[PDB]
Amino acid sequence: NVPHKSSLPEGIRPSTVLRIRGLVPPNASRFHVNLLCGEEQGSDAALHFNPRLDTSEVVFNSKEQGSWGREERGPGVPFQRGQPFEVLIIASDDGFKAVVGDAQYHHFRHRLPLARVRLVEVGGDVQLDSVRIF
Amino acid sequence: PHKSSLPEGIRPSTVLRIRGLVPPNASRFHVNLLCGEEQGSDAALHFNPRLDTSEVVFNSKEQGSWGREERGPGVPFQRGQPFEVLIIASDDGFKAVVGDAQYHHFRHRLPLARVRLVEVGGDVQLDSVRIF
């Protein structure tokens, strides 16, 4: 399953929807969904979606030229060890809408131009069902 | 006969998630994006899967009259089986997603800023409708 990579050579425009489905395994610690600007190592991360079950948090951040931005946090962790999940990452002109389950979870304002995203990466302690880009 | 009101309309990058299942002896159902609460109001999108004819019709009703019909490949709705529909609004049009693949791209004919209501009716058992 992981590390899972979906290459977007043409990039993603606004109104693109990332649908991520999978299971949070028993004893999971944390996993991540990255929107990177390239296939190379250390590429700029327009979005770092990092649910942390060991600390019961979800961290949002970006990375530009090796430096991490300031972390944002959503209301609690909407994931459970031993439970499946469905995440929507909806890219708008203003930013990324993160939907978990049946409710909007957090809006991450754009820190990098959306037109730079060219890679979706899923890693960490997660057993992926499917990654689909609409 | 389910309706969902939208007072401030829908901006681009709006997602409409529809979940449900078609009855075993069902023919056709629809999802409409109307321009107001009034009856017979203009429709920016008409999403009408046709199971008896094995087709899916896209159209728009303007000034009371229907426009030129568009049709998607085949029908991704099997009788007696559940489904999940996404209608994604962009600057260019509506991306209709069925299942795990994009089914059709309906380019805007009416201004998106006019959509004020989402109505789902016909031969469909509606389980949940969410707007993100």
Residue numbers in the entry:
A (entry chain A): 2 to 135
B (entry chain B): 4 to 135
Question: Can you provide the manuscript's text about this entry?
Answer:
pmcHuman galectins (GAL) are oligomeric β-galactosidase-binding lectins assembled from small (∼15 kDa) protomeric carbohydrate recognition domains (CRD). Among prototype galectins, galectin-7 (GAL-7) is recognized for its preferential expression profiles in normal epithelial cells. For example, while extracellular GAL-7 can trigger apoptosis of activated T cells following binding to glycoreceptors via its GBS, it can also bind E-cadherin on epithelial cells independently of its GBS. In this work, we studied the impact of homodimer interface mutations on the induction of Jurkat T cell apoptosis, allowing us to positively and negatively modulate the biological activity of GAL-7 by designing a covalent disulfide bridge (G16C) and destabilizing mutation (G16S) to control homodimer strength, stability, and biological activity.
We finally prioritized individual substitutions G16S and F135S, as they caused the largest ΔΔGB among all remaining variants. Based on our computational predictions, mutations G16S and F135S should weaken GAL-7 homodimer interactions, while formation of a disulfide bridge in G16C could strengthen protomer interactions and favor GAL-7 homodimer stability. Consistent with our MST results, G16S was found to be the least stable homodimer, with a dimer interaction energy of -11.6 ± 0.1 kcal/mol. Conversely, the G16S mutation weakens GAL-7 stability, inducing a 9.1 °C decrease in melting temperature. Our results show that the G16S mutation decreases the proapoptotic activity of GAL-7, yielding an EC50 of 13.7 μM (95% confidence interval [CI95%] between 10.2 and 18.3 μM) relative to 8.4 μM (CI95% 7.6–9.1 μM) for WT GAL-7. One of the most significant structural rearrangements between WT and G16X apo structures occurs in the local environment of residues 8–17 (loop 1), which exhibit significant atomic-scale deviations in the variants. This local rearrangement of loop 1 involves Gly16 and its neighboring residues, particularly residues Pro10, Glu11, Gly12, and Arg14.
